């Protein structure tokens, strides 16, 4: 019971914010921008831990999405996006990042 | 007479809380209380910055909110102070509504 | 006469200023709230030097009275008060320390 | 001619001062002397802080004052600095509206 | 679908850009790329002062952000971080008037 | 010629600026404030290097003067102006200060 | 043609200056030029205080910005640098005076 | 071809800001000033590293110019343009200064 409830508070679940945006130096190529997974932020994390970018390089994978809400690139094309990664990718994590339900 | 001290001496006494249903994780009722002072404390200690730093630190500090507001209907903790990174990782909508709906007591 | 009047001015008198307010999270109940003694501020001063919490608890049972202008806790029961006490009770010792007539 | 040096140089022609009967210390005349600049200094060296802490320290800084102003009627101090301690153990209502009738006079 | 990864993944998909005719370089063109944010870190950490230290320091991070925004149509840098200083001393109003046009493209 | 302007430029004065004052609290009696001189300020410095008041006591026995533009203390009674010197006495330094042409 | 180079180079080409009769000092002219851009230097560097101490820097600036605007009529400095103290003992509502007379030129 | 680009990136140019002003500490004289050329801003940074004045002599005589465009002064005149260098030099440097076009 107690046991239960910790258990429901515990599990893994998803249910995350989603905003459609259209990309101008893109073509206005359609995006789907979601937030980050804790499992990403763990990741962000051990990066932090140009280490800064190499870091938001792995959140920008987990938030950037196709029209079927599913990442466009996979974790193991971290050093690939690491190359060609710049200000329009960074502008694309700052409003995924603003879908965070932040308390205040 | 007992009627004040007996108020002032309950389980509870020092929290503004309420019951709420939770109908993502099965229709439980938990209970919300406002935060301690001692966790308002944590908070602003948690809280030139990247973007992302700006956000993780404000998540981490939501999830020390979180997991003091959070109890179970016998008004007891769900978590201790010592589980607040496995919260961390699981952390998400429904954990930072609850949250919200616990901060709003205080209003 | 310089020695009366020291006397006099060293003496232990109360005079406190006393408030009453009510409680909406203990069923509307009504209390009565008094300044702190300087006998209760020099325990509160023993226990600052959690801690700043045993402290304030000093302070507000000295504060927290009945209709009856007399403390609702002992000092004797400091400890349970310490494991009951939240932002209700220094809610209400923050009310009671407005009741000090501060120079300035 | 004296006239001046006089004034100038008698006791208490440094501070502003008057006679005040206390009906609660049994009807006694003090006098009440505006701080001396030696006693201001102190009362800004005494004043993220607790709410308690916030008021204690004024307490101090307030009986700091009240010791400096508070004179016999033959304009003698009736504290040392010295016994600041000892005041603050029962400094109450009437040394405090003593303080303020004192501090009245700068007005 | 292949069509948003390959635009997420080209050449230069991280920046806005665009390609400029310089007359007074023979008519030759270069691409022009709004700064990364490795180039607007150092901008703002290169820059009581004397009127030439202010105006020599922003001369630096002018040509720091220069170096950074100046590309060959082949989307390629046409001078290194490391050669600032080279850079520095033949910096003058062409390369001034590219640094505008490039910091156009934020705006 | 640049020798006589120099001694010029460089002899003793005085010519200072003087205001005349009431003192309430000293039954209304009118006093003379002037400027203090570079001999005192050379005296000032001397004690500054309770300290400040000693100090500040050789100014306002410089600077205050009866109706007749004289200095109502001397020098020599620095020590007993020293024990009856309190805030009446330094409000009316604060204006014998205000005198001083001041640049800016 | 030499009418620049020679306006540009001439002794006091760099301060705005003046020539003034100094009726209190048995009518003898002294030229006043702008202070250097060296004696504005220490006149901020020389500017809780106690009132006297407020005054008395005051004072100290004022006799350091006097020393280097006051020149004889062949446009030499009266007083070096080295003899600020010496000054400062002296200073009174003369030179005072032309200090601000000196400061005006700027305005 | 980006062998050329960057040779042509690379050459010394000229094409400075000009800017006619009079002067009347100087009987109203014309005056060019001009940006100063990065070869002046090296020696100044020599200089740089009464040393910040000496540094600023040479830019002022990079900057100040006759009618025809040219130096007034040369830049072995330093230690004569030093002795007499004061306000007046430095609030045309000022403005010769604000000549650059400095980006934001």
Same mark, same amino acid.
């Given at each position: 019971?107690?046991?239960?409830?910790?258990?429901?508070?515990?599990?893994?679940? *998803?249910?995350? #914010?989603?905003?459609? &945006? %259209?990309?101008?130096?893109?073509?206005?190529?359609? +995006? =789907? $921008?979601?937030?980050?997974?804790?499992? *990403?932020?763990? #990741?962000?994390?051990? &990066? %932090?831990?140009?280490?800064?970018?190499?870091?938001? +390089? =792995? $959140?920008?994978?987990?938030?950037?999405?196709?029209?079927?809400?599913?990442?466009?690139?996979?974790?193991?094309?971290?050093?690939?996006?690491?190359?060609?990664?710049?200000?329009?990718?960074?502008?694309?994590?700052?409003?995924?990042?603003?879908?965070?339900?932040?308390?205040?």
């Amino acid at each position: 019971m107690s046991q239960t409830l910790k258990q429901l508070a515990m599990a893994k679940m *998803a249910g995350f #914010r989603h905003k459609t &945006v %259209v990309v101008p130096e893109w073509e206005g190529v359609k +995006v =789907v $921008l979601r937030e980050p997974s804790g499992e *990403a932020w763990l #990741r962000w994390q051990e &990066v %932090v831990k140009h280490r800064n970018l190499c870091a938001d +390089v =792995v $959140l920008f994978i987990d938030v950037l999405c196709d029209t079927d809400k599913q990442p466009v690139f996979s974790v193991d094309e971290e050093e690939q996006v690491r190359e060609i990664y710049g200000p329009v990718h960074s502008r694309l994590l700052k409003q995924a990042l603003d879908l965070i339900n932040n308390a205040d």
